[model samples]
Target chain A: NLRGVMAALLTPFDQQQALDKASLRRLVQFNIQQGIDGLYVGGSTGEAFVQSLSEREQVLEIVAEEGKGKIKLIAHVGCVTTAESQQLAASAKRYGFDAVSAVTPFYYPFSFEEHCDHYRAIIDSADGLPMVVYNIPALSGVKLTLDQINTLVTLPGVGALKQTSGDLYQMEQIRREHPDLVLYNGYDEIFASGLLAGADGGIGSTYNIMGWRYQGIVKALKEGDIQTAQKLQTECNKVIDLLIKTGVFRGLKTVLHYMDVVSVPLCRKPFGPVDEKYLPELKALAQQLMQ
Target chain B: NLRGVMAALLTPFDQQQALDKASLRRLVQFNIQQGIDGLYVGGSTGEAFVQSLSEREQVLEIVAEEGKGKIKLIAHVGCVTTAESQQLAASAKRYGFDAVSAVTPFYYPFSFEEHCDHYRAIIDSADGLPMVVYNIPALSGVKLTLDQINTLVTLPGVGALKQTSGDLYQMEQIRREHPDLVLYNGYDEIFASGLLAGADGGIGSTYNIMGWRYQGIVKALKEGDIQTAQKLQTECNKVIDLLIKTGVFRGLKTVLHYMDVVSVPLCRKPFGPVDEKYLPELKALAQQLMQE
Candidate 1:
C-alpha cells in the first residue's frame, strides 16, 4: 500500500507573476506523460497567494480532465475562507478528480474548533470524494498532533494525508497509528527513508523533474536490490541537498527550467528569481545519471 | 532634532472593524488633548489590512481634518500593491495630513531597486507633502541598510523615519548619519533606549492607549529630568513586558477596554476577539505606580 513518487507541480507565472495558463496546462500534461505517480495541486511551490478563486477552479478542473485515471490528481483546495475552500472542493468533484487535497489554512490563528470547521466544510463539499490533508506547519503556524490527525481522520470521506514536517518521530507515530490512512511523505530529499518507515508514497516539488530516476529507485527497492536503490537514492538526494542549501523553491525552479520543462525560472514574488548563470550547469547535471 | 514621543492613534473601528468616523474624530481630539507630539495614522494597529481603499482615504481625511496644525498626522500609506500606496499618498496630500508613512512593501521578494521604486512612486503621488519612511523589518521583511536609508533619505519629499526594528546599533548609526531628519522610535518597549540613542519621538501600537504617560517620559527627557524620565520609561517598558508575556494583543485590548478608552475591544476578523478574561489583573497592574 506504500511507496513511489509524485510531483507537486509548479504553477508557471509570467515575469509579472500573473498565472500563465498555457504553460500550466503543458506542464501538467508533460508530468503525466513522463509517468509521475500523481500530481500535487496548489501550494507554496505553486504560488497560491497570487491565484484567484476562478483560476484555482480552472486549474483543478484541467488536472482532473487531463489526468483522468491515467494519472492520479490531488486537488490542493485550501484558501483563507471556508466558502472559497468549499467552492474548490465542489469544483474538484464536478471534474471527477481522483482525490482532493488541501494545505492547512494559514495567515490567521484559529482555535482547534475553527480549524476542524475549515477541513469539515471542504470534505463535506466534495460529497464523498477522497480527501488528503496536507500539513506544513512552518508556513501555516498550526502544527497537528497525531491525536488531532486521528480525530480528523474519523470524519466522513477523510482518506489520507501528506506529511511535510521534518519530525521523524511524529511521522513514525502517524505510520503506526493510522494504518488505514494513506500517508504520503512530502520530503523528497528523504523519500526513501520515509518509504522505509511505511509511507505509501512521496509527493514533493522535486518529483516534478526527477520522477523517472525516482521510479528506478522505487523499482530497484521493490526488486529487493537494496544497494542499487541506495546508490540511486543517494545521488537523487545530493541534487535535493544542493537545491535546499541554496534556497528552497528558487533552486528547485532552476533545475526544472534546465530540463526544458519550463521556459523561465521564476519564484514566488518577494523571493528573488533564480540566478541565470546557474542554469546551464544545472541543466548539464540534470542530464547526468549513474550507470 | 530627534527625541521624544509619537502616538499610533487608534482608528476607532466599530465591532465590524469598519471605520467609526465619529469615534475616530473623537480619538483624534482625545490624543491631541493628551499632549501627544504627533500621530502614526493607519499602521497595523489601525486595522489597515482589512480596510478598503475608500475606507483608508476616509480615515485619513478625518484624521487630517482634526489634526491639522494641532498634532502632526503621519498617515500610513503602505499596502501589497504600489497602486494603493500611491492612492493613499495622494489622498493624504489632498486632505492636508502633515506627513505620510508606509510599511515597507512585502509579499514578493523585492530588490532594493524595487523598494526605491515604491518610495519614488509614493513621493510622486504626494506632490510635495513631507513623508515618513516606516521601517518595521520584523513584519515587512524589508530591512534597509544604514547606507541604504542614507541613500533613500536623499530622495525628494522624504522628511523623516520611524525605526521599529529595535536594533540599537542601527538606530545609533542612523542618528549619527542623518542629524536633521526627524527620527521616531516605533517600539514602545524600546522607547527609552531609542531616546537615549537620539530618537526624536516614539510612535507605536502600545501608544494607542498610553500616549499621555509616554509623552511625560519624552517631555521629561526633553526638559532634562533624566531621573523621572528614566523611571517613567521603565514603567512603560514594564507594561510592554507584561503584555508580551501574557499573549499577543489580547492583554493589550483588555487593559485598553478596562481603562475605558475603547468601548469595544476587538481586533480584525479571523484573529478572534481580544480575550476579556485577562482584564482583572491588567486593571490592577495598570493602576499601580511601579512594578518591581
Candidate 2:
C-alpha cells in the first residue's frame, strides 16, 4: 500500500542450482542503496513457478531477516496447491514481512469461487498480515473480473493488488471500484499512467534493474511535472520496447549481466543464457536512457 | 503417412468421474462405422491431463484393446515427468495400439537437452511400436525446431508427428525433411490448407462431434469439387469461430452434451460452464449440417 517503487527482487541461484544467500544479501543491499522502495519476492521474474516450496522459504526468510525494517518487502506466496500456499503465507507472517501476495492457482482449471476460497485460505494462514493479491492472467489463464475483485476486497485480510497484465481499462476500473484499495502497477511499462489513473505504486520485473529511473517517473508525477514525467516515461517505454522485442526474460537477464548484478545472468534453461544477438541493442538502449 | 481424417477420440466420464468403458467401446465403434481414418486417443481433447496414472492406463487400454486392427488408435502418452511418459508408452504397446504420441512435458522448464532426453527415453521405452510427437505449443511451450525434429526422426521407434502449432514454415520443413514421416495436422481449423501443403491426416477435437462433415470436405476436394470443399471448410470454420468466441471448451462441451456423447459438460469453473444461450443455435447448425 506504500506509494513508491517496489523492486521484484530476483532470487539468485548458485551454479549448483542452490540459493546463493551471499549474492541475495548483496542484491538486497544494492536495492536499498539505490533508494528503491520495496521488494516483491518470487514472481515470473523470480522464476517462482518451478521453484520448490523449500527454496521459496529459504529466499523469503533471507528477505525477512535482512531487509525487514530497512526496506518494504512483499512476499509472493502463490502456488498450485492451496496447502502449500497457506504454509508459505504462515511462514511469511512468522518472518515479519510487510505484506504477502499469491498468484492464482493454475494448470488444473479452477473456478472463480475456488479462487476466492484459495485467497481466503491464504489470508487465514497469514496470521493477520496484510495481503496483496497478484493478478497476472497470462501465466494463470484466469482473468479476475471487476465483480470478483469487489468480492475479494471485502475479505478480512485482503488489502491491495499488484496488477501485471497492463490492461489500463481494468486497472482504471479496479481503481474506480475500490478507491481505498492499494493498487500497484505491476507492469513497469505502464507505471506513470497507472499512477495517474490511481495505482498506489509501481512493482515489476524490470524495476529490479531500473527502480531508480521509475522512482524518478513516480516522483515527477507526484510533483505534477507532466513534461518531465512524460520525458522519463517515454525513455522507459523505449527500454521496454527493446526488451519486449527481444523476449522478457532474455532482455532482463541481459540487463542484469550488463549492470553486473550477477557474475553470470543465467535464466533457467530452455529460455536462457540471454539471446547474445539482442544484447548489443539492449545495452545501447540502456545507454540511451542513462542520466 | 496417410492423408484424410484422424479423429482425436473423446473420453466419456461417468457421474463418478471414472472412465466409461461401455461408452468408450460404443464411441470407437461409432467412429469406425463412420469410416474415420484414425483415432488419437488420450490427447488434450481426451482430458488426459486430469487422468491419474491408473486412469490414463485404463483409458488407453480400453481404446487400444477395443479398436485393435478394426481402426488405427494413436495413444497420447505424455506426463510432466519422464517416468510417467515411459510407463504410458509401454502400456500402449502392451495393449496393441497402432502407435503412440505425447504432448510436450511443460509443468517445469526443461532445456533443449532435457526435451531431447525425454524423447530419447520414451523412444527407448517403446519396445517396437512406432511413436508420434505431439506439438501444440499454445498449451505446451516446448516447441521443437527443424533440426530437433530431424534428430528425433532418426530415433529408433519415433515414427510421425502431430504438428499442432500451425507454423506453416516448420510444417513445410518437417514434411520436406522427413518425407517418409507421417506429419498429421493437429489443428482442426487448418486441415484443408495443411492437406494442400502436404500434411498427412488431421488430428481434430471437433472430429469427435462433426467428423463425417470434415471427411466430406476432404472427400469433396479429392473429387475435384473445390467449391464444395471450400463450403464445408467454411462451415467447419464457423463452428470453430463460434466455439472460440464463446469459450473453446465451453462450446465444445455444449455441443457434446446436445449430441449425448458425454452425459454432462462440466468445465472446471473460472473459465465457466457452457453458456446455455448458445446451445439451441449450435444444435440447429449441427442439425442443418448433418442433413447434408
Candidate 3:
C-alpha cells in the first residue's frame, strides 16, 4: 500500500557527530509541512550502513512518534549479516513501522541463492509486516535480474519494490509483467521517466530538501501536464547536478543548513563536512531554487 | 620493505561459522610449505568485512602466531568506520604484521578528500608500522586517481600499494612517479601483465590455493623467460576462469577443501557453499593442474 512521493529522509548530526534529535524532529515536521505523502526512513540517504544499531532504532522511534499516522513510513533494515538484518526488521515491526525494506547484502559477490535466502530471511522475520525489496545496485552490488524479481515478488510478505537502477527497460518489463506489484522510482534525476514508464511514485535523496518540487512532478504528471512535468524535472536536475558537483550528501545537508532546519552541516567523517568555499554560492542557489 | 608473492589469506570457518583456528593454521602452513613470499591476512579474500571486529582480531592473532618471522605478514585492517579501522591497524602492528593495508571505505560515495582522510587516519594509526594502500575499486567502490595516489604516497607511513584495479595506466603512472613505493599485483588472471608493467609482486585470492603457479609467473618474468611467464599466466587464468564460473570465494574454498587444507568448504552465508554438482569437476580440475 506504500505509494506516492516519499522523501528518503536525511539524518542530521551535531558538530561532534552525535544524532541531533531536535534537528531530526524539525526535519520530519518540515517534510510533513511540505505535504510529502510518506517518509522512507533509514535508507542510504540516512547513512544507515555507517550508523550503529542504536542510532538507527532511535531514528525509527523518533520518526514513528512524529509521523506514524500523519504519513506512510517504510523502515530500511538491511545490514551486513542476515541476523542483524532480521533483528532490525523485528525492531521495525515493534516500533510500529508501516512496512520494512532491505538493501541487497553487499561487500561480497553473493550468489543468486544467497540473495534469495537473504530476502526470505528478512521477509520471514517481519511477522506479517509488508516487505519491500530496495534495489540500489551501485551501492549494494547486487542487481536483481527480472528472474530474481519474479522470485522475490512471490514471497508472502513482499508487496513492493523501490527500483533505484536507471535501467528503464527492466523497469518497464517489471511493470508490464506484474501489474499488482507496487513500484517506487528511486533516482531523483529521472523520476519523471520512471513515472511515465509506470512507477506509481518516487522515493529519493533530494526529496528531503525538495519534496514540494517532486510532489509537483507527481501532480503535474498525474494531471496530464507533460510539459510542466518535464520543466519541473529539468529544474530538479539543476539542483541535482549542483549537488553532485559539490558532493551529494554533504551538499544536501548544506542546503538544509541554509533553510535553518539543522544547526550545522555536519556528516560523520571519512565523509567531510561540506567545503566552506561553496557555502555562499550554495546559499544563494538554495534561496533561488526552493523559493 | 615488504615485496613478493602473498596469498590474501582465507579465513577458515567451521560448519557453524566459528573461526577454525586449526584449519587457519593449516592454511598458513600450506602457504609456507608452497614457499609463498608473504601472507596478506584479513582482506576481501578472507571475507574481512563480514567479520566482527573481534573476529578480525582473532584472525590477525592466529595468522601472526603462525607466520611471524616465517613469512612477511601484511594485515588488511580496513573497516566501514575510521575508528574501527584505526583499532585494527593498531592490533596488526601489535601482532607483528610487517605492514598493514586497508580498502577504501565503501557502501557510500565518499569524496576524494574523504578517501584521503580515511587512508591518512589508518596510516597515522599504524604508528611506525608500514602501511600499504589497498586499491581494489571493484569491491570497494572507491577508485583512487593518480593525483590521489600522489597525495597518499607522500604520507610518512605509507610504504606500498596493492593495485587490484586492472587500470594499467594508473599503475604504470604510479610506478614511474614513485620508484621507491612497493607495488603488488592484486589480480591473479593478469599478474604477468602487472609484473611486466612494474609490479614488485602479487597479492591475490587465487594465491591462497595456487601460490606455486603465481610464484612461477614472477620467477619466469624475472629470469627473462617471457614465453614461460605467458604460458603460466594462461594456465593461471584457466583456474581463475573456473573460480569465476563457480563463485570466487566459495570455489577457492572448495579447491582448498579438495587439497585437504580445510575440513569443509564452508563459507559464511549470504555467500553459500560451492554447489555440490561443481564439486566433482572442481576436485578433478584442482588435482590435475595443481598436482602436476
Number of the predicted model whose TM-score against the real structure is largest: 3
User: How would you encode candidate 2's per-residue C-alpha lDDT over A104-214 as one tens digit per residue?
Assistant: 898888998898999999999998888888888877788877688778766778888878764544555566667688888876655665665457787887776677878
DockQ of each: 0.01, 0.01, 0.01
lDDT of 1 by residue, B93-186 (tens): 8988777878778878888888888888998898787777888888888778877888777677788888886554456557666867688877
Flag clash pairs in model 3: none
Q: Is candidate 1 or candidate 2 better by TM-score?
A: 2
Docking class of 2: incorrect
Could you give the CAPRI-style class of model 3? incorrect
Q: Report the first chain's TM-score for all candidates.
A: 0.90, 0.93, 0.97
In order of listing, the candidates' clash counts read 12, 1, 0
lDDT of model number 1: 0.71
lDDT at position B12, candidate 1: 64
Q: Which stretches of candidate 3 lie over 4 Å from their true place?
A: A1-291
Give one digit per residue, the lDDT tens place, for model 3 in B154-249: 767788888886644355557666767799878776676566445789899988877898889777755655556656766677676678878988
Q: What share of the true interface contacts does candidate 2 keep?
A: 0.00
Q: What TM-score did chain B of candidate 3 earn? A: 0.97
Candidate 1 chain A weakest ten by summed lDDT: A189-198
